[model samples]
Target: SGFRKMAFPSGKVEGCMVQVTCGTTTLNGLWLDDVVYCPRHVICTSEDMLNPNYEDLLIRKSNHNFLVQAGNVQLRVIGHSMQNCVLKLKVDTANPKTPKYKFVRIQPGQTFSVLACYNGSPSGVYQCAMRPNFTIKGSFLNGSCGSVGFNIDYDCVSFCYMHHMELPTGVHAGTDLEGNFYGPFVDRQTAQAAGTDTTITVNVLAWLYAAVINGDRWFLNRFTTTLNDFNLVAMKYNYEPLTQDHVDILGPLSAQTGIAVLDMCASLKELLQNGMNGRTILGSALLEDEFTPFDVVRQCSG
Candidate 1:
């Protein structure tokens, strides 16, 4: 006899909904007459897991994962079919509804992953400018409506051969050289809304890297030829400023900014320590445009 089996479980229910707890944001899902649904704007997590910190770190996927930082590092969303049915799901992100969301149809032996690096906005799900807040709806298309299962996984990645450092305590990247503090924002929306003056926003890490290079004129003029490139290329753009804790200090910058930040450099350092130095992957594929330049990493180590 050949080894073959049915994909979905025989179990069936009239309706199904799951109550998801992601940090402080709780979603009480609902079933609306043949549709599995959650409350409006059901987010995956309220936590921003990419804030920088002072220790080495590691992040792994678990049930009900949320989004992470984009620019300086990469974040991934993976969906898998856990039943024997044609599982059709719609994923809605921060982008508007026109093209709106995306469909993940996972058949009996299939898996899908979406890699996001930046919110391109004004279009497409993959380009969400910051960490995405996902509103997901799913059902089985095999003439059944209940007891279906799917799993979503989240991940964060950084440059493969880059120098990783636990930011020194004295380096306040969100503070300008004039001793004025700005940002510590989680996304561009929050940054723009926080202040309207010369505090014009950039990624927190971009600002920090600028601070590093600004102090080292040798590396500054050596790598960058102009101010435009200096601001644009020094670090990852859209890098959230607050290191998770900064939010507590700043207080309710946005609906999404209240969570603590993850120490991105520390997380990447842990990956390298474990001998897992793989190239950065964007949207489930190799990111050709991302890397730590030799000189950049060399100077950063000091």
Candidate 2:
């Protein structure tokens, strides 16, 4: 024998409407005559329109559920027998417990459109997932709204390594004798007296000696060389100096005055305290710039 199934109660009213009643009393009903319809379809003998209750209602095959109280419910709208006309619906119940409802429906033949009703309520995440293809197409369309192109090249070498080399006795290399060399020259006389073998040459040493002898004046030459090298390095690296703090203080001071005044003062104080010739150190002509009044005392000590 074939399986026998119990029949569930069902009924349809006129004009795209359906009515469901309990016993002799009509419980609730739905009508799709207008583009929009509320929970009640028409006035009835009973207070069903005012106090009717039902889980759901179906129009033809489209199901609409009524949410009691004050909020919205989700409903899916689908056209009859259409493959494309299926869309998601979000209904606002406006009630506290039943804030909103969501569902999906398929249309007969036309493409379906989904819509949401926002009234300060949370939305479903699936809404975004449903439109992946549409999102990709939109991004591609935006690409043509701008320009497109391409190119190629190489950067130039600006800064090079400074190698230390011994120069012939009296010959200077870089301007201000700032280049690499061999000699610890306190002055022209000390440099001349040392001859070739005992001399040490290098830009750093020359600058140091110049700073020591001329107070701050010798720094002018060293500073100029340093500034030149600093600028070259910065430019090579595509850097821009935006403030005084960004500048190389030592290079500029030496270039301008031939002395790093403050640093030299500290060095001299340390030298004297350590018992290095207070007179020989004081006699280095550079001392006269800052200690002119002490000349007599310097001489007496010498």
Candidate 3:
């Protein structure tokens, strides 16, 4: 007896969309149309109750599925998907017709993950996402949006990580500097915009955010290097000089900054301005050419 049966749920196999919340930015998707009519069959012809497809030469196909944590303004947009067909989606950032609104392309069976760069968004818990939806030479195609939620704890991150992010305990980097720790070395007057009492422009802010990652050296350098101007910037904001309260928050963030929060308002102001310009400050210090050891150098050889 050639026994065989349609032992599979011939359900609906139409177009679909998946919304995944990341942080503050939402995943706007477009591709693959709505239900273009199909059977809601099971997956991978390699299915059928773990037995051979002897029941039927039927087959199902799709994509598969992970972890990354986001924080503050830098939220992580990530997720997993399972599609019956090939998936392609071009994602811009928060930008619109001008650009952004799209970041990169992702496959349906991928672990979507990227930093939710919302430009110069304010402080708060934001929402971002990874929308996986699209089609090429198949059925119809259109929109499939997903989303996520994150926060822009810049103030906290800026204020905290700027100092004691390193060291397991005790040693507060920013404040506990050795004797003769003075400002004015970095040259704040030149950095601050003319007429404006700000130094750490908005670009600096964004840079700070991006630089504040897990890399201890990166965070430390950015934080400390900026300190060259922090003291004076603090004075300018206060219109006088750093106060004890300011001192409290100025060092290893393990403590707290009260009125001192205002001590660096100028820096914050400039930082915001930096983000507004859609530009960043330094680090364009890309190497000019191949690295040469001091011994291998002959400058005047020109």
Candidate 4:
């Protein structure tokens, strides 16, 4: 119980077929922001089947060298921390000590984005292998003070079935139908015709939730379909972006509901300053649970 936990619900929101591996070592589990736990040849779709046996594989306080294979989608890895951490992308190697173009170092406060097939044009691959040399040194990890622990923020954009999700309370029927139902219907058809991922007409209604709450326009580049597919379910719920008022309410709500929010900030202060409690603005709730309507906004008018 001492181990802190954070909810990564975006992986599920994106509905990408994510698999974790280290060379030949494959873990048959769900992929969260950090810890991709359990083991599997079969893709575990939900985080509810969590097995504590493989909990510490992706510890934030330790080192890691692995790869995430997000099938048919382009993704980005954003580093979060004021600490001195080094992330070397495993690109190439010849000899153990030979000088070669073998890696890309991702320092703190950086984003490495990959583009997959989009709009009938081949972009780039959607996989990343972290070199074993990756280091996480910070006060949160070692209690040395001055710096914070390292956090890897993973996000992606793909045309998954976003409409099938249950809508939050206070959403008008027409808005929900067009935004959630018919919108996805057309987007999937468009993606099929374009022979690529959904980029033209895909509406990330829930994606906007994080975008506004996190107060980052970059989140608009990442979208997901489902709301409840949290990969890691634990304490700390680290990614609730927004300000003090919203953070005080939204953070606990996220943890209580077991839906992970995206972390797009370098520090807690950054999150508090950016988040605007957009939950009321969008009138959205967790996708997997029933929510009572907030009286602040009337669905009929908005």
Q: Which structure among the candidates has the greatest lDDT?
A: 4
* Tens digit per residue, CA lDDT, model 4, 9-122: 232222322334443443322223332222221122234123321223233222233454456432232221111111222222211222111112332111122222222122
lDDT of 2 at 18: 22
List, residue by residue over 117-169, the lDDT tens digit for candidate 3. 22112112211111111111111111111111111121211100001011122
Residues 1-302 of candidate 2 have per-residue lDDT tens digits of 11111111111111112222222332211222211122122112234333322212123223333221112333332222211111112233221222111222211111111111122111211111111111100111110110000010112111110111112342321101121112332211122333322111111222333434445332222222243444344344332321233224334433444544334333433432343333443234222211111121222233
Q: For every model shown, what is its TM-score relative to the native structure?
A: 0.16, 0.13, 0.17, 0.17
Worst 10 residues of 3 by lDDT: 157-166
State how far residue 50 of model 4 sits from its true place (Å): 12
- Please give the CA lDDT of all the candidate structures: 0.22, 0.22, 0.21, 0.24
For TM-score, candidate 1 versus 2, the one ahead is 1
Residues 65-86, model 1: lDDT tens digits: 5332212222232331211111
Q: Is candidate 1 or candidate 2 better by lDDT?
A: 2
